[PDB]
């Protein structure tokens, strides 16, 4: 229910940094191991 100017502004902002609608195919980029080595990862979330 936001005004159109802000909706298009935030949408172009998110698309600028490639957070949404990022044109990419994973068949042309090979995999790799990051500086962070293998470990044991968890994501803590607030109780719903």
């Amino acid at each position: 229910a936001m005004d159109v100017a802000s909706i298009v502004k935030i949408h172009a902002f998110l698309e600028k940094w490639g957070l949404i609608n990022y044109q990419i195919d994973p068949r042309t980029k090979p995999s790799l191991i990051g500086p962070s080595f293998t470990g044991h990862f968890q994501v803590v979330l607030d109780t719903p």
Binding site: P30, S31, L32, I33
Partner: protein, 212 residues
């Protein structure tokens, strides 16, 4: 072009020492500037000019009876010949500036073209006829670097007196960041690169390589 050498030729002779504790440094600066002015007078007199033979064994040449009419002499060095021929081409205003050959030049050159470049003219003219200073400059530049070393150690300890908290944390970070650089090439030494001990990031690298 000057030839590059393998040893330092000069040194900056630093000037961050306190000029009220160490004395006679300005005496050194005055002596160096004076030696810098005592050789600008020598190099000048090495390019010295001399006028010793306008007119005045192979230095003496007998001129032909034809060229003896453009010179006034019958013998003399080749320098006098080419100089006096040029002077004759110059006095009579023969160069085209609006060389145009004169009447007697027709005979002396045996040419009837009446117009010839000066290059051909002088062609027809020919057709008709030290260690010790290096040691001193290395000994001095071997002391201005010892001075440039003691001055750096003074600069360090003096900048350690003021702000010791700032210098010590820099020393501890330089240490923790340089002992790592020196320990980066101890993995490839040909006696620990064929014993299969370092092959069990040398595993993600083969992933990047195979993809490449």
């Amino acid at each position: 072009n000057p030839v590059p050498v393998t040893y330092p030729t000069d040194a900056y002779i630093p000037t961050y020492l306190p000029d009220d504790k160490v004395s006679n440094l300005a005496d050194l600066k005055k002596l160096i500037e004076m030696d810098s002015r005592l050789d600008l007078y020598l190099t000048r007199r090495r390019l010295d000019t001399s006028i010793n033979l306008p007119t005045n064994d192979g230095g003496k040449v007998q001129y032909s009876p034809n060229l003896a009419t453009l010179i006034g002499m019958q013998t003399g060095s080749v320098n006098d010949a080419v100089y006096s021929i040029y002077k004759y081409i110059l006095i009579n205003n023969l160069f085209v500036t609006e060389v145009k050959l004169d009447s007697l030049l027709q005979k002396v050159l045996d040419t009837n073209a009446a117009h010839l470049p000066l290059m051909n003219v002088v062609q027809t003219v020919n057709k008709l006829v030290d260690a010790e200073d290096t040691a001193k400059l290395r000994e001095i530049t071997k002391l201005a670097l010892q001075l440039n070393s003691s001055a750096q150690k003074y600069q360090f300890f003096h900048e350690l007196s003021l702000h010791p908290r700032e210098t010590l944390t820099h020393y501890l970070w330089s240490s923790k960041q340089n002992e790592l650089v020196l320990q980066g090439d101890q993995y490839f030494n040909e006696d620990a690169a064929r014993t299969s001990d370092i092959y069990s990031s040398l595993m993600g690298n083969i992933s990047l390589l195979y993809s490449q």
